[PDB]
Specification:
Layout lengths: L18 E4 L4 E4 L4
Antiparallel strand pairs: 1-2
PDB class: toxin
Keywords: Double stranded antiparallel beta-sheet, Inhibitory cystine knot, toxin
Assembly: monomeric
């Protein structure tokens, strides 16, 4: 799928492209470097 920033996530399959789940940000954050 593809979730926008701040989207609750389980590990990374919920974050949009260039976005990953983060326990520090509490959601999908910009994974620019990737």
């Amino acid at each position: 799928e593809c979730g926008k920033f701040m989207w609750k996530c389980k590990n990374s399959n919920d974050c949009c492209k260039d976005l990953v789940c983060s326990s520090r940000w509490k959601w999908c954050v910009l994974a620019s470097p990737f």
